[PDB]
Amino acid sequence: AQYEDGKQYTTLEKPVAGAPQVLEFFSFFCPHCYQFEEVLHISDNVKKKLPEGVKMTKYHVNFMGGDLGKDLTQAWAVAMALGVEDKVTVPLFEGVQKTQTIRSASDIRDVFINAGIKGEEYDAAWNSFVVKSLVAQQEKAAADVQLRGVPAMFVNGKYQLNPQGMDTSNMDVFVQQYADTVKYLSEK
């Protein structure tokens, strides 16, 4: 066929019940993730092609960057709890990978302060039980799909995107192929 298991996607041997409809994992330490977000804009182009009523979820992961990696997963939980993802995503990516000005939990916090999140608001969220559970949701989702690499995208807890099995000489074409595969899997 055109879309084939093992080409544009793989199927989880052990499907995940109740998973988000479109789930992406990433790390702010992840060179391809930085590419996916700033250069390729994968999330935004997938969203443009998603059917009615399908929401996209994006979680941070721990296994890159050691102690800072965990701090970033907790900060991403803060970003989700406060709804400021679109204010911190770029400076976090650039702080970690471009300027290398993010070396501690304090430097992470600086990004939120510079983005206009109040210090007292940031700290109350950072320490909150709501954020501890949102950390746990991210960790659970990754564990459930036995995630060992990022970027990664999963559809309905059953299918995993296989970007390796797509074209990459044209960036634009890769992105639409990625987005179209998500739409196809979405309707499957």
mmCIF file of N, CA and C in Angstrom, residues 14 16 35 41 62 93 119 137 147:
data_model
loop_
_atom_site.group_PDB
_atom_site.id
_atom_site.type_symbol
_atom_site.label_atom_id
_atom_site.label_comp_id
_atom_site.label_asym_id
_atom_site.label_seq_id
_atom_site.Cartn_x
_atom_site.Cartn_y
_atom_site.Cartn_z
ATOM 1 N N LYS A 14 2.363 -3.901 22.425
ATOM 2 C CA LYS A 14 1.569 -3.845 23.636
ATOM 3 C C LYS A 14 0.891 -2.480 23.753
ATOM 4 N N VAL A 16 -1.385 0.844 24.474
ATOM 5 C CA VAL A 16 -1.540 1.562 25.735
ATOM 6 C C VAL A 16 -2.954 2.103 25.847
ATOM 7 N N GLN A 35 15.483 20.978 16.334
ATOM 8 C CA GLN A 35 15.182 20.993 14.891
ATOM 9 C C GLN A 35 13.653 20.894 14.655
ATOM 10 N N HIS A 41 9.107 22.795 12.711
ATOM 11 C CA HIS A 41 7.777 23.141 13.223
ATOM 12 C C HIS A 41 6.759 22.000 13.124
ATOM 13 N N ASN A 62 13.003 12.597 30.941
ATOM 14 C CA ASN A 62 14.093 12.694 31.913
ATOM 15 C C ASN A 62 15.448 12.199 31.405
ATOM 16 N N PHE A 93 14.707 25.933 24.701
ATOM 17 C CA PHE A 93 15.510 25.282 23.669
ATOM 18 C C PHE A 93 16.806 26.055 23.424
ATOM 19 N N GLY A 119 7.550 35.517 39.864
ATOM 20 C CA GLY A 119 8.392 34.641 40.668
ATOM 21 C C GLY A 119 7.632 33.819 41.695
ATOM 22 N N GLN A 137 2.519 12.066 35.391
ATOM 23 C CA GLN A 137 1.809 11.775 34.137
ATOM 24 C C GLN A 137 2.773 11.678 32.963
ATOM 25 N N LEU A 147 9.598 4.108 26.013
ATOM 26 C CA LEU A 147 10.303 5.123 25.243
ATOM 27 C C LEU A 147 11.801 5.177 25.520
#
